[PDB]
Amino acid sequence: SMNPPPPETSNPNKPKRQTNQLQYLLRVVLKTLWKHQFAWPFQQPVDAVKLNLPDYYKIIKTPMDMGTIKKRLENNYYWNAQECIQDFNTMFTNCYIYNKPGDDIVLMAEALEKLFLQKINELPTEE
Ligand SMILES: Nc1nc(-c2cc(Br)cc3ccoc23)c2nc[nH]c2n1
């Protein structure tokens, strides 16, 4: 029933890079999903106490959300595109694992995921 600490968004000894792919992940991918009418349940970590989801963190062991991804991108937390891409996939997958097929939250994740795929399809070549 209690909330874990959020995922890490700062770590001084973690290696990191600023790259055209990671810039595309922020400027195009994150920006496009963030603005969407279904973005709101995905803009911060799930609060299991406020939402009354006491099982959430007994089921979801690698939590992820766009608030976390946004801070990672803004704070140049990543080494490569694939790390960031994995965070999005974890976010969508957790939603489908926890929630009941057909629930509104699943339909919202599905709309964001469709856009995500369309945008990562055009991930630019590394420079
Ligand atoms: N059942 C459920 N609710 C939510 C969810 C619902 C509501 Br109202 C507001 C917020 C803000 C973070 O989370 C929210 C989820 N966000 C991601 N997966 C979620 N699964």
Q: Domains in the chain: how many in total? A: 1
Q: Is the CB of 20 under 6 A from ligand 1?
A: no
- Do the domain assignments include residue 118? yes
Q: Classify residue 81 by burial, with Cβ atoms within 10 Å: 0-12, 13-18, 19+.
A: buried
62 by DSSP, 3-state: which? coil
- Do the domain assignments include residue 102? yes
Distance 36 CA to ligand 1 centre (A): 15
Distance CA 34, CA 40 (A): 8
97 by DSSP, 3-state: which? helix
Documented resolution in Å: 2.0
Q: Which residues constitute the domain of residue 36?
A: 19-123
Q: How many helices (H) and strands (E) does the chain have?
A: 6, 0
| Residues in contact with 81: Cβ distance below 8 Å, sequence separation at least 6, in sequence order | 19, 21, 22, 24, 25, 123
Which region holds residue 52: left if phi is over 0, alpha if psi is between -120 and 50, else beta?
A: left
Q: Is the CB of 6 under 6 A from ligand 1?
A: no
Q: Is the CB of 90 under 6 A from ligand 1?
A: no
Residue 124 DSSP class:
P
What is the DSSP code string of 70-83?
HHHHHTT--SSHHH
- Do the domain assignments include residue 11? no
- Which runs of E-coded beta strand occur in 27-107? none
> Which CATH number is 101's domain given?
1.20.920.10
- Do the domain assignments include residue 114? yes
- Which runs of E-coded beta strand occur in the chain? none
